[PDB]
């Protein structure tokens, strides 16, 4: 094996969907899934 499928998963759409109140509550947790998005993007680049 050389590479695997490049998957990008979004925070606000997965955890909260299209809910503004849920996003406002999610802002209290900080930048957890800025980190998560960054890690997934890094894996995606590493595959290429």
């Amino acid at each position: 094996p050389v590479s695997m499928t490049k998957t990008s998963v979004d925070c606000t759409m997965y955890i909260c969907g299209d809910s503004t109140e849920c996003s406002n509550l999610l802002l209290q947790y900080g930048s957890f899934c800025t980190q998560l998005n960054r890690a997934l993007t890094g894996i995606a680049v590493e595959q290429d």
Binding site: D10, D18, T41
Partner: protein, 48 residues
Amino acid sequence: ALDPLSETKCTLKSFTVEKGIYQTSNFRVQPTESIVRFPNITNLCPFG
């Protein structure tokens, strides 16, 4: 929110952006109308 260049400047937390492609936000189609579909019954409940 002025333009994509400023949006990617804000995403990188910097005023100068290097050459490349950056993921900034998500495009989503906002709904236009509200639809309600309830059964055509009209007999009031015997709550009283």
